[model samples]
Target: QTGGSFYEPFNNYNTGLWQKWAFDHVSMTSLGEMRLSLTSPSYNKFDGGGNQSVQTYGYGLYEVNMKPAKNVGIVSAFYTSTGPTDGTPWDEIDIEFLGKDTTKVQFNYYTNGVGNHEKIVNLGFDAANSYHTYAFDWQPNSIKWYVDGQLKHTATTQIPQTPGKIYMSLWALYAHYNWVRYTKR
Candidate 1:
């Protein structure tokens, strides 16, 4: 508990800390929920989704409480990433929900622009039905994924080493996020 930490409850949008990158697809409700949505069905014409943290972090615990949209051909995601846009190697840690299968979640990561480690975990419950805590503890040697505070998966190879910004989004889908937190070690 001796690391730097940050938490956002969606009570208000903090412009200094977060920025919407794609389109204007983010909104905050009175209930302290942040909503991300996608409109249109055309691949190129659809409203692009998501927002990102203005600051970057490394080797920390990142967590989110979210309810993904349930629909085919859609994706709800919360991840940490840095790539060509940031003038850095493509490194990332992902927690994604395929709308076609809300009963499972996917974990993956990339190091130095190489990525092929994708693990799907059966969540034992529908992620679209309620908000669930999904998190990843990133360390120098390994990365651990958790669901509702329970360890679900771990990766010991090709762990991402660079600092990256956090992102949350819904594309070809919709989702509600209760909060997001990052504790740096």
Candidate 2:
């Protein structure tokens, strides 16, 4: 049987449903946001923070309400991935924000570890200034990306087939996610 759908408000850090993969740079804010931060000044120190869902999901609509970090060299991301750790071929879907350009977001995916599909969408607003809804609808033959309810881009090649765990991270920067939802098709 396939997994059902769920929504995460991030009111608190739910250890039962999510795991922190890095240091203690993940926390819940008073306003119920999941905050990921870089705690060290040393570039050599891997003090960046990240989290992944405990469950794996297949074809679905993955969405998040988030604000990216506004600083050069920072990357705020929300994606789905499965790879060597899961003993599966590398498959991933990505929604990444490069801190140097908060007005644009990058969409990409990989199948069997072969990936060069990078599509950048102009968001028309600074992603770090306010929260916005970002999403990707993954179907058997296509992937569509959306920004704040508007369709931004779509890809029909090299669609991933493996189930993947949901992920969010902030490194060399700080990001906040208000919520995440996954609705299986």
Candidate 3:
């Protein structure tokens, strides 16, 4: 009863009269099985142009089946992080799929603050092209990262603990060395 929120502000970004309407459109993510349709370049863009937060301060297995923006050179991701109001400044566990290099993806596990971040990587194949499931299982004593339902990384901590959120995001990331193509890939 104390740790979760699910709301959908569909049209609140427009401002003015539509503002009230957006507030009323709160709903759960996709009510059916995990499936996201690719229609336009911005199908999943939130109203304020930022990420959304799911479960917080809780440990559960989460996975996503996604294909990256066709050669878009970004991580089509399903990870977890928290908002500013989470009391704990920053504690996150994320599975970020790197699009440019098929074999390179990132796993960031942070505690206490964002500055104290611990990260690792996964390399092998085009995870996006082929349907694969990725997730992290975090318990009080340790944390585990998995790919295609196989355990790959584990970190055990003796320090104090912090609660975080579940962040599920889909976006295009571009670094100086790599960039997305002209098309809406």
Candidate 1: misplaced stretches above 4 Å? 1-4, 41-47
* Candidates ranked by lDDT: 2, 1, 3
lDDT, candidate 3, 33-151, per-residue tens: 22222222453334211233332446544444443433453345554554445555555666665556666667666666543444546547766555555656666676677776788
Model 3, runs deviating above 4 Å? 1-57, 70-73, 115-120, 158-160, 172-185
Q: Which candidate has the top score in lDDT? A: 2
Model 1, 26-126: lDDT tens digits are 88889999888877443421245788888887898999999988999888889988844656798889999999999999999989899899999999999
- Name the candidate, 1 or 2, with the larger lDDT value: 2
Residues 1-185 of candidate 2 have per-residue lDDT tens digits of: 13469999999788878988764778889998999887655341244668888888889899999998898888888999884465678999999998899999999999999889999988999999999999999998999999998999999988999888888877765799999999897
Residue 33 C-alpha lDDT in model 3: 23
- Which stretch of 10 consecutive residues in model 3 shows the poorest summed lDDT? 176-185
Give the Å shift of residue 133 in candidate 3: 0.9
Question: Whole-model lDDT for model 2 versus the true structure?
Answer: 0.86
Per-prediction TM-score: 0.92, 0.92, 0.58
